[PDB]
């Protein structure tokens, strides 16, 4: 990792950018929540630009990113660069309306969840559904369109093109360059 | 012409050790084999067994109830998951176990996909453990209510016990029992 | 394996039985292809019974037997004992109309087939695409029903009883005792 | 981790101490450090405890709860992401009034889980259920709700959302925002 | 295995049954096999059970208690190289007066070891106490003593000689060679 | 202070070795701030890659188009598949390889589930297919169809076949060329 | 900077997980090192620790009687074998646990070669089953029959039970309970 | 194995018996067995016990050992390859008088060895003594073997002791070295 | 990995204190010469302290150390705390005579050296086996102020002595209890 007169990445929150790279889970969801946490007590009026480059990954770690992204002041940017899919998609689809963006060649992709005793197996069964089920809503919420919109296009993997992603309403802007 | 096919001619037939689709289906064949040779005599089905797979024992079940002779069982060492299942099974009035055997009943038991997967099979589970429990309440002349609470988690009996259940007939310490 | 004054298998011949337990395999399937054309060859004038307990396995060892069921002279009845899923719901839909019979607690399920370069990558999922169809087609001629109902009732594992794989129309008739 | 001072570091000046991933000894003695820490640069200011945790040892947990317990600082908790098993434990240990939960987040509770000879599997068996109620009557504390309700509650793994939380005990809070308080 | 129909095949009809090594469902079943085969030749017989065996499954083990007790040939055994475990066990199971030892074999005895939630470790902790307390009275009842004496000699590891395990009362006598039997 | 910040400073920014998520936003996060450093010059990304992920590839590609600086390319070693990629999509007239240095283009290339599930897979792979030929046209000044016939199998080019097809602007040995 | 050292500072020295050489070494360094600074300031050792290596503890156990600090003990978490015997080690008057820690002590467990070896070795074990036995009766003002019957096998003890076995003087629930 | 019925069923009808590698329980009771099926077939004729081993379990050879002493037949015992560890000790307790060994043949004889192995010192105090038994046991009965003092023998197993078959000869342990039949 | 207070074992070389900790390697074996060296350095008229918690390791590692702690001007006093065993207790043995130390509960364990192609290679490893196994004798024996026989006796096979035994043996000159 580069230093410059602390490290590339330190210099770069520096510009409010935060990024999330490859797989979420519970370590990387949390190095993310840290930073907007960090940002917002730097300044809580002035906008963060969160990068997404992630294949997804854990249901309750992108959550904890989810939740801090709605909870803190400044708004959150979003921006898919490479791809965003899954848990990624979800987060992108997730930043303050009007301010979620991809580059012009990324990709979004869309699904729904996949991962003893019989008794235990219900148990699991159950949370799955549910969580399938809050998925689906809040992405209507984000997207503005119908749940069993939502249903119908998460059944099995659904790849979007940036500008198909726009018009289903995951993101607001396609961006070329400044 | 080893032990295992001398008793054969004594109408004995063992399933030992867990039950898989290829343990079960050679006990199957033993069975067919046996009322070819004689559909009017009993058959002897010495179980000594920790269990295995569902559709595997069910196998072996249905061949119990299609041919014509009574399947008498008996538990030697321990009829435990789907051995307890198949000793349930032996015709009324003929399933034995030797005094120091045990048995133990539990719900089905497992070891990936779209959460749309993974609902269908913990569904299909679920159906096998309700059918579970209705046939062995079936067997052992309880309700099904008994069944379903008792085979929540593992559940041992002594021989004693499991007659007094109903899973078996008689216990046998020798001939003259 | 047990002997008799042969083997139980070859013994169970004697009255024209020949097993498919566990996964259908090229050489599993080809065994049993062996003992229908031996039983064939013994007597072409008398049905052949052909006890299925397997959980699937591969299409082509699958067509392999289920062409020579279609081939040899005698109707060949079938019986699902145990569990006949995939290939094996294939087979057991297969044997002679009227002669399809399963045991009163096994049961069937039927699903969709499931598993370099890009040019590769079209070429095998063409094939997939393909079999799908044709698996599709068989399956609905089998239970004379409309190839559009086994395309919905394929598309995730669709796990059947007795009774209902009767009423599908992929046995004929469920066997409690002779 | 981004330093200059690292991230983790910088919030802790903020009095935030995180519990991410699974409760281990040196996961938890770490968040002990911490909490020491704290209340040694300030005993009288709230510390701020961020829990996203599957669960973990019990004795590793214990040693936080005990410290939470011990320290003069008030320690409010915060469920992101979920917290689980133990994760949920700490989580119900907060500062009464100062526990909370995100609004997508989930909380989870049952029992415990994990040779010899059959002397020594009784004295660990024993001992595991000594702990198995010890818990069930610390958390129907935590819940102000009795020991037989937790002990039908955990029986299996029990999931609850953040209002199933709230309404249970486990939580006094759900904050979407600073303006839910 | 020599193939003289085989030597263990040969020694069965002599009516001599052997339990070499650890005991399994499936070594165990073949022993059972043995039994009823011998009794079924013919069931007026004794049948002579030799045993070399540090142990393995109690209930494996079961199935060959229950096989020797319940066929009408007396089941005599004898301890030749070792009988541990559940080989004790067995060994001391044979028709009484009929139990013996070869001079430098041993016994060895001890109460059961082995190699999930709260609730499936308490299921399973109580059946293994279940298991090391009838396996004490089976075993007092071999031996003639009181359950006490057992439970406290099965604690640990408790190796014995020959002469040992006969005062013990888990054999009747040892024999040097076929001269060496009395009563 | 290491070798690789000391020359940032010199707005040079490495790719070695295989392009992943982890090693592609490393470049794109130098990048940014090497624009945010000064916007109005150019920027020399050197690449000796034998390729990797198509979709982090894509993160870089699409921030050298979208920051202010020209990013000039130089080609050292080899640049392969999306290597090669990338260094075709260098500023027009600033795109470079050093003499003994080689260029590799392809098509996808991939290292499971229903046939429903290849039938998407494969498609959005031939959709990402097409799309690089489609822009590898682009930065060549050359048909699709030239770019799809000559990426089918593996097709290694000197500097000088590169600069040629179109992939290149110069061929640099020193400074004075 | 790092949080350890920051609290070696208030004079606090935690083992955490198993007794190894190294681990040990560590806490005999920091003990060193706090006499050095302060003499006659106490040092505060918390334990969390499941046991270990039996020399290694005992070479912490000779420092904490060696250094002129008293050494005031804590047990959080659990301290069990060696971690116990260092708990009980620490000054009389100043052994302390968490309401909710446990204590275990048991004799001495190993998890080859000539039966002359083994004997060696056997020797040996039962020379330290015995020392141990000895000094944690001494710790606990108890007979040296009470120790030997109690670690026979794994002897789990609440807080409560530590106190009143006298392996610790008082249990802390906060500074209001000394 | 050739099949002229196989080689060793074949060398059975010459009352020669085979322990051939380590000894295991299994190892040990193929010989047991054959040992018992040749009494049965004459027990006055001589048995022919060649051995070719480097040791092995302890009551597996014990097995062995008090089978060789039980039975009516003389075993006459053949030193071929090596015999060492246990296999020495069965070599030594060939009929005296017939304890033979091939010229160039090698004995090795040392006190027991476990290979690895745990636990409670309450468990390891029980196991170390039950080896210390052993190792006495073994050299009193290695004494009596080789008519020679228990000191003796004592000394002499303390480390890996390699013997010539005349340096076995002048122990005690053997009683011929053969080169062919006219020795 | 280690507090820092640069770090806490730097701190303690302050103190002229040098650990052993753990087996003697190559490595670990090196960095025990390199402080001796640098204390050496810094001041020649003072005491080391070679505090030793450790099971052995390779001899001529050990040597490397020993013939260090003979060729350096300051005393190099010893103490065992937790085991000195094998070569560490040759080292603990080899400190400045009346200056080998032990806390009351360490041990110390002496023994014969212990390892674990073609013959003419097998002879000349066994051969220098012996010549080591003779050397450690002799130079312990030396130590101990002992008979060579004694040692040839009593490293047979694994010998373990409390800090007592390690007294009366002539291995170390002192137990300590306390610092006063
Ligand atoms: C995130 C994914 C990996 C997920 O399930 N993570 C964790 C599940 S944890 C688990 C495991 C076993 C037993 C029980 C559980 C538990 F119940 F606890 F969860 S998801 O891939 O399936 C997914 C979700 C949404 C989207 C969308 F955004 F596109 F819409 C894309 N992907
Ligand atoms: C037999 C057991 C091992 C079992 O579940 N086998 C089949 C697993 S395959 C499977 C895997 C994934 C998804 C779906 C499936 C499937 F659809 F195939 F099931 S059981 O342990 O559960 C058991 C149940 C009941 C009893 C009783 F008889 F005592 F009452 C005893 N044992
Ligand atoms: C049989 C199954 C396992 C199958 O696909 N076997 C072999 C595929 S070979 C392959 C592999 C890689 C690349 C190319 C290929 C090729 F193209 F060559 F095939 S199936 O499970 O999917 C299935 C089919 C039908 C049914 C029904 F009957 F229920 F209807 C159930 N199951
Ligand atoms: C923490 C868990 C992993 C646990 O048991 N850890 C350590 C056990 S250590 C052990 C191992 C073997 C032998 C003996 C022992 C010993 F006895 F020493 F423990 S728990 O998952 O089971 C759990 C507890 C509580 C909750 C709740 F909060 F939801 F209520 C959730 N989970
Ligand atoms: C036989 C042994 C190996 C044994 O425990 N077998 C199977 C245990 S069952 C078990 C384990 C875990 C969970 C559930 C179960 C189950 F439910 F299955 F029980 S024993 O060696 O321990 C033994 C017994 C008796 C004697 C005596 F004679 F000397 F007295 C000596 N040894
Ligand atoms: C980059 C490579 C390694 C690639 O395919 N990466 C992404 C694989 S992930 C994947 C896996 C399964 C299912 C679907 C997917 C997904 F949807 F994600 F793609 S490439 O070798 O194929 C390549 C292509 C073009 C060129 C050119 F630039 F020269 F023209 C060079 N290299
Ligand atoms: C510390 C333990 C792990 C122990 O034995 N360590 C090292 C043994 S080293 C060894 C190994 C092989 C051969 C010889 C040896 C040697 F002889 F060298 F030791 S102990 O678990 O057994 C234990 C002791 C005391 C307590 C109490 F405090 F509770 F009382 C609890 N536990
Ligand atoms: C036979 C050998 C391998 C042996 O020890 N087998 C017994 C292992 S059982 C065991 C395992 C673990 C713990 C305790 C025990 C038990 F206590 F039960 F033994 S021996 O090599 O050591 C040997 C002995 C004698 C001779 C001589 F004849 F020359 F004199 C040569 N070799
Ligand atoms: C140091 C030990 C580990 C040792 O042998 N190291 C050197 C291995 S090099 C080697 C490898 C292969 C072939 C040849 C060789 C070579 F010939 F080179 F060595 S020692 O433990 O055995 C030991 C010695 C003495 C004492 C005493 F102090 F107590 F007296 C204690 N211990």
Same mark, same amino acid.
Request: charged share 25%; net charge negative; aromatic share 8%.
């Given at each position: 990792?580069?230093?410059?007169?602390?490290?590339? %990445?330190?210099?770069?929150?520096?510009?409010? &950018?935060?990024?999330?790279?490859?797989?979420?889970?519970?370590?990387?969801?949390?190095?993310?929540? =840290?930073?907007?946490?960090? !940002?917002?007590?730097?300044?809580?009026?002035?906008?963060?630009?969160? %990068? &997404?480059?992630?294949?997804?990954?854990?249901?309750?770690?992108?959550?904890?990113? %989810?939740?801090?992204?709605?909870?803190?002041?400044?708004?959150?940017?979003? !921006?898919? !660069?490479?791809? =965003?899919?899954?848990?990624?998609?979800?987060?992108?689809? =997730?930043?303050?309306?009007?301010?979620?963006?991809?580059?012009?060649?990324?990709?979004?992709?869309?699904?729904?969840?996949?991962?003893?005793?019989?008794? *235990?197996?219900?148990?699991? =069964?159950?949370? !799955?559904?549910?969580?399938?089920?809050?998925?689906?809503?809040?992405?209507?919420?984000?997207?503005?369109? *119908?749940?069993?919109?939502?249903?119908?296009?998460?059944?099995?993997?659904?790849?979007?093109?940036?500008?198909?992603?726009?018009? %289903?309403?995951?993101?607001?802007? &396609?961006?070329?360059?400044?």
């Amino acid at each position: 990792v580069p230093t410059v007169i602390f490290d590339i %990445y330190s210099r770069l929150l520096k510009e409010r &950018i935060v990024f999330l790279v490859g797989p979420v889970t519970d370590e990387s969801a949390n190095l993310v929540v =840290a930073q907007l946490l960090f !940002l917002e007590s730097e300044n809580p009026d002035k906008d963060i630009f969160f %990068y &997404i480059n992630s294949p997804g990954g854990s249901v309750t770690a992108g959550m904890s990113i %989810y939740d801090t992204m709605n909870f803190i002041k400044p708004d959150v940017s979003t !921006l898919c !660069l490479g791809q =965003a899919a899954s848990m990624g998609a979800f987060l992108l689809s =997730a930043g303050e309306k009007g301010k979620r963006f991809a580059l012009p060649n990324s990709r979004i992709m869309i699904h729904q969840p996949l991962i003893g005793q019989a008794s *235990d197996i219900e148990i699991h =069964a159950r949370e !799955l559904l549910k969580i399938k089920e809050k998925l689906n809503r809040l992405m209507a919420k984000h997207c503005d369109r *119908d749940l069993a919109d939502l249903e119908r296009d998460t059944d099995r993997d659904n790849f979007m093109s940036a500008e198909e992603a726009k018009e %289903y309403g995951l993101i607001d802007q &396609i961006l070329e360059n400044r």
